[PDB]
Design a protein around this ligand. Structure first.
Ligand SMILES: Cn1c(CNC(=O)c2cccn2C(=O)[C@@H](CC2CCCCC2)NCC(=O)O)ccc1C(=N)N
Lengths: 10, 250, 34
């Protein structure tokens, strides 16, 4: 899988 | 999905992907029923036998996708869970009875050409469509064979099967809160859901008003697309009252 | 109704009166055939 933006890791 | 095919763009605007934060991986399928709620299978969140027991902060919800692994920038929408609700009488111990769960999204999701909710059935619709022989549609990014997987969302159209035939095909104690689908050995056509498709939607289009209704939830099977075996789905309507209850209260 | 007013109508299909590649297999089965 292609990494997802960290702004959605909370 | 086994023996299915590549879904077309916007074909299943309600299809949701349950995504695990760490490691980042496909967890399950799910469906959008409004802007704040997505419906899925309980075993996706809780399943002691396999030490499965996720919580709100462990997951991410991805809506509007087509591709399985790419971050479809500007198209897909990633959302956080605020609350998970597992049916109180979900039986993971014996036969996965009442395999259903509701997830409350932290922030409402804005609809688009690739993001749109599916209708939940009413007593009449369910009564007219949920009949043996009537075909339904299943979608998911799960495995393509029992034991490489899809690059793009997959879909199959399967017929609902007579309750008696479902029972005589397994030793698992079937209940009223579940139905089965798939072709019979001589019917020539085949296909089934499979690992990775769990929590996904089983839908039908109403010939009366042309809307799509989710009648079932991808739940369990024995192997994938085996002759003589069928996929089992959670009977959405039978649990519709638990669903409504949850939403107005919370 | 028992599903908010706009549910079940896809933007790229029902709303533009376009059908998908296999939806007809479904309807063909909602009465007498299989
Ligand atoms: C829906 N499906 C799945 C996903 N379900 C699941 O993964 C489900 C959750 C936990 C076990 N499960 C299973 O389906 C198990 C059967 C399960 C029934 C209830 C008691 C415990 C066993 N089958 C696995 C196998 O035979 O290989 C795999 C294959 C299908 C299908 N035939 N369409």
């Amino acid at each position: 899988y292609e990494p997802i933006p960290e702004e959605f890791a909370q | 999905i086994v023996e299915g095919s590549d879904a077309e763009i916007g074909m299943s605007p309600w299809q949701v992907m349950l995504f695990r934060k760490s490691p980042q991986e496909l967890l399950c399928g799910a469906s959008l029923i409004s802007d704040r709620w997505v419906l899925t299978a309980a075993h996706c969140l809780l399943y002691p036998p396999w030490d499965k027991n996720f919580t709100e902060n462990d997951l991410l919800v991805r809506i509007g996708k087509h591709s399985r692994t790419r971050y479809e920038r500007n198209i897909e929408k990633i959302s956080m869970l605020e609350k998970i609700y597992i049916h109180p009488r979900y039986n993971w111990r014996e036969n996965l009875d009442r395999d259903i769960a509701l997830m409350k999204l932290k922030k409402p999701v804005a609809f688009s050409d690739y993001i749109h909710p599916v209708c939940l059935p009413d007593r009449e619709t369910a009564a007219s469509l949920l009949q043996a022989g009537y075909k339904g549609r299943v979608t998911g990014w799960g495995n393509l064979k029992e034991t490489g997987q899809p690059s793009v969302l997959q879909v199959v159209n399967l017929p609902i099967v007579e309750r008696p035939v479902c029972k005589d095909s397994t030793r698992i104690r079937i209940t009223d809160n579940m139905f089965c689908a798939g072709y019979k050995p001589d019917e020539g056509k085949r296909g089934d859901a499979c690992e990775g498709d769990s929590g996904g939607p089983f839908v039908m289009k109403s010939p009366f008003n042309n809307r799509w209704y989710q009648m079932g939830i991808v739940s369990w099977g024995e192997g994938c697309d085996r002759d003589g075996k069928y996929g089992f789905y959670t009977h959405v309507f039978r649990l519709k009252k638990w669903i409504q209850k949850v939403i107005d209260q919370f | 109704g028992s599903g908010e007013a706009d549910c079940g109508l896809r933007p790229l299909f029902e709303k533009k009166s376009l059908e998908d590649k296999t939806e007809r297999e479904l309807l063909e089965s909602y009465i007498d055939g299989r």
